[PDB]
């Protein structure tokens, strides 16, 4: 049940304190103008001292040609739910986020962790994953599975064709 | 938590609340149902806070621009006037208060800013923004200030910005592109630059608010000011004979001021939804009721056809409509609350010379997207976040937290968003 | 370099002679009304006695709503090339077919063989394969590879966002 | 392989080829460029065969329905008449000969079938399909046959099919759906049923062809026949005074006959493309030239405005146009050649009672899709395939092949398709 369609490690030239502070107030910004509404639904410091943040993000896809016509028919905004945990002693910031908008159909899930750089506390390390789950089945499995579906289906039509042709053919003489 | 069998009515304290109170008295004398009119400080913010809990007034009065926010965050009831009633009011005003083809409030009157001047000091008012500094020098010489107006609300400065170029949201094909914000465009910068120059050149002062400027001009210490139909009544009783005229032109292009229709919405959390409709349709929106209000403070150009006729012989409504036509109507999109703070903070910074125009304005461009999901909560969201980012940094990360942060700003904010989610129908865990 | 998105074996209740004869005159038929033109480009009996047929099939996709408007703009017909070999002694009929229409972009390839039924010469056996090659790279690889592409790409925007926010944040005090 | 400095012109042998020949003589006398007019048997098939090689006539005459096939299989040149010339001819006829908004041939005349009857035997012709059997009995009694017409070409029987319902391709939104074929629909079956009944009831006979029926009716042995403007001339010289009128109605609905515009195309493999244009525009399509042809055999309703006027005083063109209006114009889609064989074979089967209507017609439905890729080659494709399926089964699988099969039918067929591919621009290995 595992298939991490991606995974990545990167480094910021900034101390975790400031990377984390900045991550809390990330939106809105010029590099992500599609993020139009961010709200903190709940926030708790837990028994162990870990700050928990649950945030909701609203995103408007950039298809500005028929948008006026389109939004009357249906909403143009996608929503992703987010869960972050800050440990201020061990200096880690986790962040697990799913889209809520089309999760019945598909479910992209991204996990991120910010800890200081083992070699230089001034730098910050960001490791990153992502799982696409098309139907709880990997993207690859699902996409191939479709090919089974229709390939064999069309195959099954061709065999009717043959029988019909043969029937006409057998009928000739 | 709203009581049944009364009515409570909020309207801003610069509006004609006593007049409106009188209209309630007639209502009480006829029905026996008590009416209470309030004018709470910072009402644009106060309504949302209380509305979210399920508290607040039965009826809320404000410029239509913030009603799209209010409605979509589940706070307003859909209004259901008869077809006959709608014919009674201009359809132009019904549109300002219509969101997703649902009517969300009753329009009351059309308002826009004009140039009010002192006819004893300025025989002929400047037609030109750029002529003012020159005039100030002459006027300072005779012991007076040329112009003074509210530099704290961005409404008053907006006309001068949207003059050479500058917009909230580009209007494309009958919809507003929320991704296109004309706060940071070329002329918007020149407009705002002009303003600040004027303070630097000693002509204005950044500190000036509404009251400061109302006082001075009505005292006769200044020649001009920029204000709305409401302000006329305090000028009248003062011994200054005044004119209202077009705003000076910037770059020989009209000064564009956003136009608002003062509308009246019915609280979603209100048992008295049918008393509120009768009071609004059968008492306020009549020649009688509207006069009462207008007598106390003028309404601008009423949306009631039958009283707008009896009124537009006023040479000041004339000048309001002139200026109203010269600018744009305000959007009632939810993103408006966001837009307003963005520019509000932009303007003062430039004015107090702390940030320069390009910086403050570039800032606004992006800050304009700082919407909440329940855009009625966008203001509460700002205050809670501004509180948390101070805490998180100063207290929590330094290991001095004593418990969950900014809990009281968070309390209400949470409720607004929660109500808004239901209205927007999002599904969460 | 192998990934047979599908594979199948089926049986006809008809003798290979007649299944093969009927396969030669398969089109046009009611079960495949999307096949509107079939032409034999070349046919040779080879030195070993094997009949070779190269056929071209034209197919019109069934999207009859805007077809009148659509065809003026561009052709609505897809083409598949076909190669068949008949051995009349060993009684086998192979058939390798590709689409020619969008092969630069993608290339579905189907292989079919008709021999008599080992247990009953009267019946005929049809085994069947199919290879999808999206870019000469399997469908699965290609489709996952896209996720790399954009996932990491969006990841790279988020890191700009962070820097910009941080720069503004660092600038405050 | 077409010679330069001559012209060679093909037109069907039922058309007025001598008349057309005379028009060439005037052309030769004026230019000195020789013109040769031929009438080759089965020309609808013969052109394609020769055109594919690069041989054939310079100019080809046929009903417009097969020209879309011809053109798209790379055999016809795009015609380029002046705007002034086009005004000379009806724009209705320019359309019949227009494919992918390119003109592919010159229209000459509009043709449709009518009822020709013997005025001495039928004082008043039956207006009703269903009245015929009853009439035949009376007529047989006086020693004659009521009706006789060409039962071999499906053109002649088509009107009776498309009467109660029945179509080649449904016409939807300005295009023909090639997937929708009305050969197997309910009324198409009833139409064809009626026909066969008539043979079974001894009234007609399945064997009757064109000549058989022309002979009998012009001999005075039969009262009616169904034919075109061309056939009138042989009736004239015979001592039978005749009328042309509307076709009998089936189920009280008009008999619908497909209409063709006899058009004239210029071979893609022709050096003489500008002689062919002058001959066609400046000699044939004139009052003079068209008369010459029409005198020899009538053209129906000419597409030249200036001669159609001088002609439509003819009470027979009148009746042609009546019937022409009562049916549909023929499609010039490439799928037409396919359609025609499908029905052609359908009809005889029913007629000779070998297949029954439902079988033969169901068969046609699908056989109508038996197009080649180069639809000009659809006929050659049939003959080669019909040859291979006989061989493959009888010879090759039985192990009696002596070499590659049906090599001569294959030879030409290959070339047509090859030319067609280039024109259609498909890429192969
Ligand atoms: O501020 C006084 C004056 O301005 C108002 O306009 C508002 C706008 O409607 C609000 O949404 C706010 O954030 O921005 C403007 C002020 O900056 C009212 O329209 C007007 O009645 C009121 O008197
Ligand atoms: O057959 C004589 C008569 O019919 C023709 O109509 C054709 C049609 O145009 C061809 O494409 C053919 O396959 O089908 C019909 C005959 O079944 C001609 O239009 C007409 O001039 C000709 O005399
Ligand atoms: Na999930
Ligand atoms: Na290939």
PDB file of N, CA and C in Angstrom, chain B residues 2 8-12 39-63 66-77 104-105 263-270 273 375-377 379-380 412 416 419:
ATOM      1  N   UNK B   2     -31.059  36.734  19.673  1.00  0.00           N
ATOM      2  CA  UNK B   2     -31.771  37.978  19.421  1.00  0.00           C
ATOM      3  C   UNK B   2     -33.205  37.863  19.927  1.00  0.00           C
ATOM      4  N   UNK B   8     -34.123  45.740  16.733  1.00  0.00           N
ATOM      5  CA  UNK B   8     -32.908  46.531  16.970  1.00  0.00           C
ATOM      6  C   UNK B   8     -32.184  46.797  15.640  1.00  0.00           C
ATOM      7  N   UNK B   9     -31.759  48.044  15.476  1.00  0.00           N
ATOM      8  CA  UNK B   9     -31.337  48.557  14.189  1.00  0.00           C
ATOM      9  C   UNK B   9     -30.014  49.275  14.362  1.00  0.00           C
ATOM     10  N   UNK B  10     -29.001  48.836  13.611  1.00  0.00           N
ATOM     11  CA  UNK B  10     -27.703  49.496  13.636  1.00  0.00           C
ATOM     12  C   UNK B  10     -27.505  50.272  12.364  1.00  0.00           C
ATOM     13  N   UNK B  11     -26.935  51.454  12.522  1.00  0.00           N
ATOM     14  CA  UNK B  11     -26.562  52.286  11.406  1.00  0.00           C
ATOM     15  C   UNK B  11     -25.408  53.110  11.902  1.00  0.00           C
ATOM     16  N   UNK B  12     -24.460  53.428  11.025  1.00  0.00           N
ATOM     17  CA  UNK B  12     -23.246  54.167  11.410  1.00  0.00           C
ATOM     18  C   UNK B  12     -23.569  55.513  12.037  1.00  0.00           C
ATOM     19  N   UNK B  39     -25.895  53.187  17.253  1.00  0.00           N
ATOM     20  CA  UNK B  39     -24.780  53.598  16.408  1.00  0.00           C
ATOM     21  C   UNK B  39     -23.401  53.197  16.956  1.00  0.00           C
ATOM     22  N   UNK B  40     -23.149  51.870  17.038  1.00  0.00           N
ATOM     23  CA  UNK B  40     -21.920  51.366  17.667  1.00  0.00           C
ATOM     24  C   UNK B  40     -20.614  51.702  16.917  1.00  0.00           C
ATOM     25  N   UNK B  41     -19.609  52.207  17.637  1.00  0.00           N
ATOM     26  CA  UNK B  41     -18.269  52.474  17.070  1.00  0.00           C
ATOM     27  C   UNK B  41     -17.758  51.307  16.237  1.00  0.00           C
ATOM     28  N   UNK B  42     -17.077  51.618  15.140  1.00  0.00           N
ATOM     29  CA  UNK B  42     -16.480  50.608  14.240  1.00  0.00           C
ATOM     30  C   UNK B  42     -17.450  49.459  13.856  1.00  0.00           C
ATOM     31  N   UNK B  43     -18.662  49.857  13.455  1.00  0.00           N
ATOM     32  CA  UNK B  43     -19.797  48.951  13.161  1.00  0.00           C
ATOM     33  C   UNK B  43     -19.532  47.959  12.029  1.00  0.00           C
ATOM     34  N   UNK B  44     -18.719  48.380  11.058  1.00  0.00           N
ATOM     35  CA  UNK B  44     -18.351  47.538   9.915  1.00  0.00           C
ATOM     36  C   UNK B  44     -17.680  46.234  10.394  1.00  0.00           C
ATOM     37  N   UNK B  45     -16.895  46.380  11.475  1.00  0.00           N
ATOM     38  CA  UNK B  45     -16.261  45.282  12.181  1.00  0.00           C
ATOM     39  C   UNK B  45     -17.202  44.707  13.256  1.00  0.00           C
ATOM     40  N   UNK B  46     -17.866  45.569  14.028  1.00  0.00           N
ATOM     41  CA  UNK B  46     -18.711  45.077  15.138  1.00  0.00           C
ATOM     42  C   UNK B  46     -19.868  44.152  14.691  1.00  0.00           C
ATOM     43  N   UNK B  47     -20.474  44.393  13.539  1.00  0.00           N
ATOM     44  CA  UNK B  47     -21.592  43.544  13.133  1.00  0.00           C
ATOM     45  C   UNK B  47     -21.198  42.079  13.004  1.00  0.00           C
ATOM     46  N   UNK B  48     -20.217  41.807  12.166  1.00  0.00           N
ATOM     47  CA  UNK B  48     -19.673  40.499  11.915  1.00  0.00           C
ATOM     48  C   UNK B  48     -19.360  39.742  13.173  1.00  0.00           C
ATOM     49  N   UNK B  49     -18.689  40.401  14.113  1.00  0.00           N
ATOM     50  CA  UNK B  49     -18.282  39.771  15.349  1.00  0.00           C
ATOM     51  C   UNK B  49     -19.516  39.255  16.034  1.00  0.00           C
ATOM     52  N   UNK B  50     -20.506  40.116  16.189  1.00  0.00           N
ATOM     53  CA  UNK B  50     -21.703  39.705  16.897  1.00  0.00           C
ATOM     54  C   UNK B  50     -22.600  38.828  16.047  1.00  0.00           C
ATOM     55  N   UNK B  51     -22.642  39.071  14.749  1.00  0.00           N
ATOM     56  CA  UNK B  51     -23.501  38.286  13.878  1.00  0.00           C
ATOM     57  C   UNK B  51     -23.103  36.825  13.866  1.00  0.00           C
ATOM     58  N   UNK B  52     -21.804  36.572  13.924  1.00  0.00           N
ATOM     59  CA  UNK B  52     -21.260  35.236  13.930  1.00  0.00           C
ATOM     60  C   UNK B  52     -21.764  34.420  15.085  1.00  0.00           C
ATOM     61  N   UNK B  53     -21.860  35.023  16.258  1.00  0.00           N
ATOM     62  CA  UNK B  53     -22.362  34.288  17.425  1.00  0.00           C
ATOM     63  C   UNK B  53     -23.848  33.946  17.311  1.00  0.00           C
ATOM     64  N   UNK B  54     -24.617  34.780  16.631  1.00  0.00           N
ATOM     65  CA  UNK B  54     -26.049  34.575  16.469  1.00  0.00           C
ATOM     66  C   UNK B  54     -26.746  35.706  17.184  1.00  0.00           C
ATOM     67  N   UNK B  55     -25.937  36.689  17.574  1.00  0.00           N
ATOM     68  CA  UNK B  55     -26.351  37.877  18.278  1.00  0.00           C
ATOM     69  C   UNK B  55     -26.415  38.993  17.234  1.00  0.00           C
ATOM     70  N   UNK B  56     -26.450  40.261  17.670  1.00  0.00           N
ATOM     71  CA  UNK B  56     -26.445  41.431  16.774  1.00  0.00           C
ATOM     72  C   UNK B  56     -27.771  42.153  16.615  1.00  0.00           C
ATOM     73  N   UNK B  57     -27.836  43.103  15.685  1.00  0.00           N
ATOM     74  CA  UNK B  57     -29.121  43.730  15.434  1.00  0.00           C
ATOM     75  C   UNK B  57     -29.991  42.901  14.521  1.00  0.00           C
ATOM     76  N   UNK B  58     -31.289  43.214  14.452  1.00  0.00           N
ATOM     77  CA  UNK B  58     -32.210  42.573  13.490  1.00  0.00           C
ATOM     78  C   UNK B  58     -31.960  43.117  12.102  1.00  0.00           C
ATOM     79  N   UNK B  59     -31.635  44.415  12.053  1.00  0.00           N
ATOM     80  CA  UNK B  59     -31.414  45.124  10.807  1.00  0.00           C
ATOM     81  C   UNK B  59     -30.059  45.797  10.877  1.00  0.00           C
ATOM     82  N   UNK B  60     -29.303  45.684   9.784  1.00  0.00           N
ATOM     83  CA  UNK B  60     -27.943  46.232   9.695  1.00  0.00           C
ATOM     84  C   UNK B  60     -27.882  47.122   8.475  1.00  0.00           C
ATOM     85  N   UNK B  61     -27.368  48.329   8.682  1.00  0.00           N
ATOM     86  CA  UNK B  61     -27.216  49.330   7.649  1.00  0.00           C
ATOM     87  C   UNK B  61     -25.734  49.572   7.398  1.00  0.00           C
ATOM     88  N   UNK B  62     -25.342  49.488   6.134  1.00  0.00           N
ATOM     89  CA  UNK B  62     -23.997  49.847   5.707  1.00  0.00           C
ATOM     90  C   UNK B  62     -23.985  50.043   4.208  1.00  0.00           C
ATOM     91  N   UNK B  63     -22.930  50.677   3.711  1.00  0.00           N
ATOM     92  CA  UNK B  63     -22.647  50.683   2.282  1.00  0.00           C
ATOM     93  C   UNK B  63     -22.713  49.249   1.755  1.00  0.00           C
ATOM     94  N   UNK B  66     -19.767  45.836   1.440  1.00  0.00           N
ATOM     95  CA  UNK B  66     -19.530  44.772   2.414  1.00  0.00           C
ATOM     96  C   UNK B  66     -20.653  43.733   2.583  1.00  0.00           C
ATOM     97  N   UNK B  67     -21.783  43.911   1.905  1.00  0.00           N
ATOM     98  CA  UNK B  67     -22.916  42.986   2.029  1.00  0.00           C
ATOM     99  C   UNK B  67     -22.725  41.629   1.365  1.00  0.00           C
ATOM    100  N   UNK B  68     -21.883  41.550   0.336  1.00  0.00           N
ATOM    101  CA  UNK B  68     -21.593  40.275  -0.312  1.00  0.00           C
ATOM    102  C   UNK B  68     -20.824  39.395   0.643  1.00  0.00           C
ATOM    103  N   UNK B  69     -19.800  39.972   1.262  1.00  0.00           N
ATOM    104  CA  UNK B  69     -19.154  39.331   2.403  1.00  0.00           C
ATOM    105  C   UNK B  69     -20.160  38.853   3.443  1.00  0.00           C
ATOM    106  N   UNK B  70     -20.931  39.777   4.010  1.00  0.00           N
ATOM    107  CA  UNK B  70     -21.875  39.421   5.057  1.00  0.00           C
ATOM    108  C   UNK B  70     -22.760  38.252   4.634  1.00  0.00           C
ATOM    109  N   UNK B  71     -23.342  38.340   3.450  1.00  0.00           N
ATOM    110  CA  UNK B  71     -24.319  37.350   3.013  1.00  0.00           C
ATOM    111  C   UNK B  71     -23.732  35.944   2.918  1.00  0.00           C
ATOM    112  N   UNK B  72     -22.622  35.833   2.187  1.00  0.00           N
ATOM    113  CA  UNK B  72     -21.951  34.542   1.907  1.00  0.00           C
ATOM    114  C   UNK B  72     -21.303  33.854   3.116  1.00  0.00           C
ATOM    115  N   UNK B  73     -21.032  34.638   4.149  1.00  0.00           N
ATOM    116  CA  UNK B  73     -20.662  34.125   5.454  1.00  0.00           C
ATOM    117  C   UNK B  73     -21.894  33.827   6.332  1.00  0.00           C
ATOM    118  N   UNK B  74     -23.030  33.508   5.688  1.00  0.00           N
ATOM    119  CA  UNK B  74     -24.275  33.079   6.349  1.00  0.00           C
ATOM    120  C   UNK B  74     -24.954  34.029   7.330  1.00  0.00           C
ATOM    121  N   UNK B  75     -24.668  35.330   7.240  1.00  0.00           N
ATOM    122  CA  UNK B  75     -25.186  36.313   8.216  1.00  0.00           C
ATOM    123  C   UNK B  75     -26.454  37.046   7.805  1.00  0.00           C
ATOM    124  N   UNK B  76     -26.741  37.128   6.514  1.00  0.00           N
ATOM    125  CA  UNK B  76     -27.925  37.860   6.057  1.00  0.00           C
ATOM    126  C   UNK B  76     -28.985  36.918   5.531  1.00  0.00           C
ATOM    127  N   UNK B  77     -30.245  37.328   5.686  1.00  0.00           N
ATOM    128  CA  UNK B  77     -31.402  36.631   5.126  1.00  0.00           C
ATOM    129  C   UNK B  77     -31.650  37.141   3.738  1.00  0.00           C
ATOM    130  N   UNK B 104     -30.070  40.567  -1.177  1.00  0.00           N
ATOM    131  CA  UNK B 104     -29.500  40.359   0.146  1.00  0.00           C
ATOM    132  C   UNK B 104     -29.776  41.514   1.118  1.00  0.00           C
ATOM    133  N   UNK B 105     -30.202  42.667   0.587  1.00  0.00           N
ATOM    134  CA  UNK B 105     -30.566  43.850   1.388  1.00  0.00           C
ATOM    135  C   UNK B 105     -31.427  44.799   0.582  1.00  0.00           C
ATOM    136  N   UNK B 263     -27.324  50.339   2.067  1.00  0.00           N
ATOM    137  CA  UNK B 263     -28.341  49.301   2.070  1.00  0.00           C
ATOM    138  C   UNK B 263     -28.630  48.831   3.489  1.00  0.00           C
ATOM    139  N   UNK B 264     -29.693  48.042   3.604  1.00  0.00           N
ATOM    140  CA  UNK B 264     -30.250  47.618   4.875  1.00  0.00           C
ATOM    141  C   UNK B 264     -30.567  46.142   4.831  1.00  0.00           C
ATOM    142  N   UNK B 265     -29.772  45.341   5.538  1.00  0.00           N
ATOM    143  CA  UNK B 265     -29.929  43.894   5.560  1.00  0.00           C
ATOM    144  C   UNK B 265     -30.589  43.358   6.812  1.00  0.00           C
ATOM    145  N   UNK B 266     -31.190  42.175   6.673  1.00  0.00           N
ATOM    146  CA  UNK B 266     -31.862  41.496   7.770  1.00  0.00           C
ATOM    147  C   UNK B 266     -31.028  40.315   8.216  1.00  0.00           C
ATOM    148  N   UNK B 267     -30.679  40.344   9.501  1.00  0.00           N
ATOM    149  CA  UNK B 267     -29.860  39.335  10.168  1.00  0.00           C
ATOM    150  C   UNK B 267     -30.449  37.943  10.008  1.00  0.00           C
ATOM    151  N   UNK B 268     -29.595  37.010   9.599  1.00  0.00           N
ATOM    152  CA  UNK B 268     -29.962  35.610   9.478  1.00  0.00           C
ATOM    153  C   UNK B 268     -30.426  35.037  10.817  1.00  0.00           C
ATOM    154  N   UNK B 269     -29.823  35.471  11.918  1.00  0.00           N
ATOM    155  CA  UNK B 269     -30.244  35.035  13.253  1.00  0.00           C
ATOM    156  C   UNK B 269     -31.257  35.992  13.886  1.00  0.00           C
ATOM    157  N   UNK B 270     -32.427  36.059  13.282  1.00  0.00           N
ATOM    158  CA  UNK B 270     -33.436  36.986  13.732  1.00  0.00           C
ATOM    159  C   UNK B 270     -34.787  36.322  13.624  1.00  0.00           C
ATOM    160  N   UNK B 273     -38.132  38.386  11.307  1.00  0.00           N
ATOM    161  CA  UNK B 273     -37.825  38.642   9.901  1.00  0.00           C
ATOM    162  C   UNK B 273     -38.987  39.256   9.133  1.00  0.00           C
ATOM    163  N   UNK B 375     -15.593  35.627   4.338  1.00  0.00           N
ATOM    164  CA  UNK B 375     -14.956  36.924   4.082  1.00  0.00           C
ATOM    165  C   UNK B 375     -15.524  38.002   4.990  1.00  0.00           C
ATOM    166  N   UNK B 376     -16.715  37.745   5.529  1.00  0.00           N
ATOM    167  CA  UNK B 376     -17.207  38.493   6.670  1.00  0.00           C
ATOM    168  C   UNK B 376     -16.253  38.416   7.876  1.00  0.00           C
ATOM    169  N   UNK B 377     -15.450  37.357   7.954  1.00  0.00           N
ATOM    170  CA  UNK B 377     -14.491  37.177   9.036  1.00  0.00           C
ATOM    171  C   UNK B 377     -13.077  37.690   8.725  1.00  0.00           C
ATOM    172  N   UNK B 379     -11.722  40.527   8.650  1.00  0.00           N
ATOM    173  CA  UNK B 379     -11.212  41.487   9.630  1.00  0.00           C
ATOM    174  C   UNK B 379     -10.817  40.775  10.955  1.00  0.00           C
ATOM    175  N   UNK B 380     -11.681  39.891  11.449  1.00  0.00           N
ATOM    176  CA  UNK B 380     -11.366  39.136  12.662  1.00  0.00           C
ATOM    177  C   UNK B 380     -10.107  38.292  12.461  1.00  0.00           C
ATOM    178  N   UNK B 412     -14.305  34.113  18.598  1.00  0.00           N
ATOM    179  CA  UNK B 412     -15.329  34.625  17.692  1.00  0.00           C
ATOM    180  C   UNK B 412     -14.989  34.282  16.241  1.00  0.00           C
ATOM    181  N   UNK B 416     -17.278  32.595  13.121  1.00  0.00           N
ATOM    182  CA  UNK B 416     -17.638  33.201  11.863  1.00  0.00           C
ATOM    183  C   UNK B 416     -17.328  32.228  10.736  1.00  0.00           C
ATOM    184  N   UNK B 419     -19.611  29.280  10.666  1.00  0.00           N
ATOM    185  CA  UNK B 419     -20.898  29.595  10.086  1.00  0.00           C
ATOM    186  C   UNK B 419     -20.736  29.723   8.595  1.00  0.00           C
TER     187      UNK B 419
END
